[PDB]
Amino acid sequence: GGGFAVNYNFDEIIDRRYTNAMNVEGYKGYLFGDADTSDLKDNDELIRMWVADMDFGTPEVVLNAIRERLNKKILGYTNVFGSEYYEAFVSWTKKRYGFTFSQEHLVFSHGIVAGLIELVGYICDKDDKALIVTPSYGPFKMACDKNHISTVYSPLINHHGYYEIDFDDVRKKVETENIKLCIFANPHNPTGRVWSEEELATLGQIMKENDVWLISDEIHCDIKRSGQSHIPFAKAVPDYDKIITTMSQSKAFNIAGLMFSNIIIQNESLLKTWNTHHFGTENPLSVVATQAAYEKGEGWLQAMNHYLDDNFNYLADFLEKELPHAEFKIPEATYLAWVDLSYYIKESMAKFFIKNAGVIIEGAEQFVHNAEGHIRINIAVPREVMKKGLQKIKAALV
Amino acid sequence: YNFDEIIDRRYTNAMNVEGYKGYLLIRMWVADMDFGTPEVVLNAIRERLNKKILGYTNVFGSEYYEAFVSWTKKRYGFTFSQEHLVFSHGIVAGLIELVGYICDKDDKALIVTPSYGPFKMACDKNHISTVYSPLINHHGYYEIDFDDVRKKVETENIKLCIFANPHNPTGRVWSEEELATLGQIMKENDVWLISDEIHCDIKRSGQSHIPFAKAVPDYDKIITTMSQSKAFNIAGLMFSNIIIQNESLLKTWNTHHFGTENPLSVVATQAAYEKGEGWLQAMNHYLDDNFNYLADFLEKELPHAEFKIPEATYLAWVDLSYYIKEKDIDESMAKFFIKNAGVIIEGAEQFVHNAEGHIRINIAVPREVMKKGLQKIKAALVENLY
Ligand SMILES: Cc1ncc(COP(=O)(O)O)c(C/N=C2\CONC2=O)c1O
Ligand SMILES: Cc1ncc(COP(=O)(O)O)c(C/N=C2\CONC2=O)c1O
Secondary structure, eight states: SSOSOEEEOTTTOOOTSOOOOOOHHHHHHHHHTTSSSSTSSOOOOOOEOSSOOOOOOOOOOHHHHHHHHHHTTOOOOOOOOOSHHHHHHHHHHHHHHOOOGGGGGEESSSSHHHHHHHHHHHHHHTTTTEEEEOOOOOOHHHHHHHTTTTTEEEEEEEETTTEEEEEHHHHHHHHOEEEEEEEEEHHHHHHHOOOOOOHHHHHHHHHHHHOEEEEEETTTOBBBOOOOOOOHHHHHHHOOOOOOEEEHHHHHHHHOOGOOOOOOOOHHHHHHHHHOOOOOOBOHHHHHHHHHHHOOOOOHHHHHHHHHHHHHHHHHHHHHOOOOOOOOOOOOOOEEEEEEEEOEEEOOOHHHHHHHHHOOOOEESSSSSSSSSEEEEOSSHHHHHHHHHHHHHHHHHH | OTTTTTOOTTTBBBHHHHHHHOOOOOOOOOOHHHHHHHHHHHHHHHHTTTTOOOOOBBBOSHHHHHHHHHHHHHHOOOOGGGEEEEEEHHHHHHHHHHHHHOTTTTOOOEEEEEEOHHHHHHHHHTEEEEEEEEEEEEEEEEEEEEEHHHHHHHTEEEEEEEESSSSSTTTOOOOHHHHHHHHHHHHTTTTTTEOOOOTOOOBBOOOOOHHHHHHHHHHHTEEEEEOOOHHHHHHGGGOOOEOOOOHHHHHHHHHHOOOOOOOHHHHHHHHHHHOOHHHHHHHHHHHHHHHHHHHHHHHHTTTTTTOOSBSSSSSSEEEEEHHHHHOOSSSSHHHHHHHHHSSOOOOOGGGGOTTTTTTEOOSSSSSHHHHHHHHHHHHHHHHTTO
């Protein structure tokens, strides 16, 4: 059955020390690069609310699938054979979004950023340009950089944390610049928008009219407030084979470390390129984990989302009371809160909050453009941890 | 340990079982083992699952480095610097990336042949042309043609040599003298060398491994790749070591490399270094006994085949030229043996060049499986021969 009867405990404090977790160990390198961080007090017991992995356990249904695979004793060369994996994945997309795609069109990457890097290389020639809306998940730009593809930004319009696409701006840029590709988060990181069919259709008709490819990164699509629906870009715009879809269970099931992602490529030419040029076999533990999420993970994921919704409600009340000049809207999707602290801001905000709050967040410097004065707070943590972090953030701003 | 155990590989999406009607029944083909990954490794992965979260991971601090370098020191007297250790998702992914950084459009790569095929495919993926130096064959004992290598390096724009130490498919464990001589050629011509040492811990009693960078310590363009994937039967975990001693290339890697690591892959690999030596020694003893049977079997039952016990690997390289000519076999020997023996092997076609007439037999299998496979191979060859 679907996992609805089990009581889960999202309040559980799970120790992440001595696990080589980037969340615990690697904030200085990620946030500050090669810069000197000697001014940071090494012995600060930091509350982690930065990188997008969860402090909630990967559900036992997923972990038990990995255990059963280990019991088969050999961890040799693996690939996705037959149709069982495909059937599990398309069953999920059909059921949840009315989205179907052919088995031939499904290929695999070792995480979605690796997929983006490879895709951009195949799609874009040296003098082609890519468009992103801003603020943006940073690896969308890094994937272009890695391929020597220049990026153009279209800043989203912001009303008090409710963001929308400036279609006039996108259209102008697509028409006047050599834009070959748009990389797009549906739903959006860091703003949390769940795009409507109408928004996606409007963007799709700009892309079709201008022969622009669009990669829809839907990795956050199953993390959303109760009652929200997700519409895949390729469902909203079903008449264009240059929409590529990326989805995984990494975010939803807290298995980013397993590096196994779905890429749906509807363009026969690009698919041939992928098929003949893509190198890599698959990790058996990663594939069994992901398949287990699709087949068995429904109940747990619902419970996780319900708990997150209560965390967002607490956060909203907390900000209203304790930081009334901050601006926040509960996002429609993701476990990431985007908070405008422009009023309180008088060095990078990530450095500020580590030094002055003992809290690790992400700031404007992590989101490319159009992010001034904001932080991103990861609240996929026990409510008690979130409370402690919010208290420290508040103390530092006042 | 019970290396005789028959482990079911069906319903595990294993290439070895599902893929052979695609890469081109008793399975003796692709290089993973039918021996279980050792419990000391599996139990490390189980312990890591008990920590509940499988999030973003990298190699932090020095415990991994300490484990790996203690292994290389103990076993080969080889040490290297922590700063020079980076990671790839398997060695072929690492080769593809390294070739891209090292070589430009009109640089060529050199490989000795016969070769592991992905050495050439790593060059093809980077649009780098490959040049072949055929090894010299003395009745299944292979040697480098130093005259040929010297010529090719001097008279063509060879930027990189990709080298297997020990060698696949011939099994050669190169001597200090061989490595020193080859290294000096490369040093004098300013040629990068990638020494792929993935088979280095699978070797006969009485054979000792010398890393290329140990034999040739004063040339910083020797790159070493090592893994526990072959030795511990964990190729599915896709996690590999690369030792880059050249500061410019290391800077390029650190700036341009993308990827995090799989926590289950890292724990597994670290466990093999920290706890694996006893199982590995036992496995090697059992493999040696498989080779002794194979050598006896071929001498008695297929006397026209040419075969030498390989110094390393679990892979037997067998010249069947005599039989192919006498029978006028006009299909690949992998098709021949699937159809006529019900045995899957790798034919000459998988090994780039200088391979015609040979097959490669994987004998990292229970001894009774190997015996059954060798019986069927022999029967298909001697049918209607005197
Ligand atoms: C839009 C988007 N695409 C792709 C990825 C990568 O997912 P993977 O396949 O690597 O699991 C992320 C991860 N979000 C990152 C992780 O750290 N903070 C973030 O926002 C993301 O937000
Ligand atoms: C010399 C050499 N290098 C690298 C690899 C790749 O190892 P990975 O990092 O992927 O574990 C192999 C695997 N040998 C292959 C595997 O199948 N048949 C063969 O000959 C090999 O022989």
